[PDB]
Amino acid sequence: SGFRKMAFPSGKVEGCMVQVTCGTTTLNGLWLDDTVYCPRHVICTAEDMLNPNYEDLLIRKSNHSFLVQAGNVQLRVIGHSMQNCLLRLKVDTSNPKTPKYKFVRIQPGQTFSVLACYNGSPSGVYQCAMRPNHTIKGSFLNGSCGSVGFNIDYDCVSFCYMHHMELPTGVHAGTDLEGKFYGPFVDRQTAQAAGTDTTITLNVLAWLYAAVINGDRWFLNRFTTTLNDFNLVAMKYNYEPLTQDHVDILGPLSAQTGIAVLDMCAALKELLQNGMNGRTILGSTILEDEFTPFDVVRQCSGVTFQ
Amino acid sequence: SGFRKMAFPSGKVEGCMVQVTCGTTTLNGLWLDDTVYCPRHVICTAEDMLNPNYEDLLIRKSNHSFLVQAGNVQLRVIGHSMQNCLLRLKVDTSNPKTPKYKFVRIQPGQTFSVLACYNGSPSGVYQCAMRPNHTIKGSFLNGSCGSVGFNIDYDCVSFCYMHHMELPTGVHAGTDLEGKFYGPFVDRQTAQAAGTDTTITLNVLAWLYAAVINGDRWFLNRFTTTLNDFNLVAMKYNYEPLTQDHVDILGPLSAQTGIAVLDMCAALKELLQNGMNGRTILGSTILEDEFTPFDVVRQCSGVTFQ
């Protein structure tokens, strides 16, 4: 037993990280087959980060403007294109370590692992959720751009995030691997602020199931709720409204614990209203919202500690 | 910025995981050079887990009693020895993916990354602290034995933990890579309980420095304390006593933030006494004790957000 924020093993992603340099700007890139992906802001001039015109900046570059390094090996750039907010650099060598991979756009509430990288060298790995306001609560310093987020299914890597910026609340913004931003953000240093966030109701509920699977029932109650009555309380506490789809997603967890979803919702409504009374749930004093139902099924025993 | 429980990138360790089978018992092993390490309890008979005599069980085995699998490749066992609570199986092939590595015994309070594995296939990675009571708060199911804990320095892997058991509180026990248990535990299913735990004072303090580096000062106060007066409060709240060595270790963090350690101790004494008043510190409502000063320096900016 136990319950931890668990990241995917990062080795298949480590073998894909390189360093990309244009002038005196260096950041991370992702090398799959004969292509290296990286934030287009690598081509920004030091005094024009406010209003860069990337089409105009990019046409002024050649293939040899870009320096790509994999460990100690220089990879020769032989073609380049811009795709939304990324660059695609074609190189002379196909990555021998390219895993099976897909590019996916993840959805708010879903989680992924981040491989924080600096100068093309991986330094750490942690799990993040895509927030409802399309930011992540990551941990990134200068040099971290081009670090990627991913999930692994069987032996296929689903890349879903490349890192681009930090906003003033200390939260993080970036794109999928087609270069489209998550959220309304743009890759320029003009003032921008994350919209107000919301708590991910489906995940809080999934995590309550985890706590039960793992043997704790203290927070349950004799009550039930309608979906609509629940959502009135949810709006009050800045929780996302719960939908029938969310209820259907909780099906398997519900089945495993013998707890109907709306009974679990009633339990959660009581927690919101009354607090936790100095008690913890899976070691936590707050209601945790960064584990999906998928994450709970992946980590917990298939057998409830009854 | 941001602050996350961050694990080391796990790729160098992934390339070392294998499956080891004796009869109908399968668990994980670690393959370095021409040796595979695994818990000796892989040789336990199904009806004798209470009182196994391992010397007696082991002499009844041959090299071909053990089946070692790396991915789809059978590795032939050609020698075996017991070392404390582990087995060392000599195999026909040296691991081509063996990284630079060391075996280290870590000390209570220190942290490491765990690569949870099942049937020789890595499934997840998370950070753990060695608790003062010599257990870890991990996340492990049946099949997880032989999963390892490690740190990485430059490109050297310091292996420090192999997993062996779960105790009744849902916490975890195991050995270093010489096979000596952390704590008073033994590898038999006879009743055993973790000693009462203590909060890791040095880490709580390191994490308060992190919160300051990252720009928050709300919890500071105008006061100072003596080491001895601090420890009277620490005993009250079940915190480890703070030592001059711990104060000297906080030197660099202290220097970076301009906060004397004993002023930070006074701040912490006020937090223990008064609570947090509904406020959070680096997103947390509890005083977190699983980040070392090393972990904070590794993750935070070298420049304080003043």
Ligand SMILES: *[C@@H](CC(=O)OCC)[C@H](C[C@@H]1CCNC1=O)NC(=O)[C@H](Cc1ccccc1)NC(=O)[C@H](CC(=O)OC(C)(C)C)NC(=O)OCc1ccccc1
């Ligand atoms: C990665 C790029 C890199 O490798 O290092 C850059 C030298 C870096 C990652 C962040 C740095 C700290 N932690 C991170 O997650 N990205 C950037 O620095 C990114 C570069 C950029 C983006 C677009 C065009 C050109 C260059 N810039 C930002 O993240 C800035 C950071 C910042 O705080 O800048 C100000 C000093 C506030 C201007 N973020 C940003 O511009 O947010 C929009 C904004 C601007 C002004 C006021 C409010 C909000």
Ligand SMILES: *[C@@H](CC(=O)OCC)[C@H](C[C@@H]1CCNC1=O)NC(=O)[C@H](Cc1ccccc1)NC(=O)[C@H](CC(=O)OC(C)(C)C)NC(=O)OCc1ccccc1
């Ligand atoms: C890994 C071995 C494996 O790959 O699966 C085993 C089939 C496994 C890891 C734990 C399982 C659940 N989560 C884990 O972290 N290890 C064990 O199962 C280990 C096997 C063992 C150890 C020593 C000799 C022979 C076999 N056994 C334990 O961890 C047991 C678990 C348990 O709860 O057993 C009882 C049902 C309580 C007997 N732990 C244990 O024996 O703790 C001591 C104890 C015994 C009796 C009362 C209180 C405490």
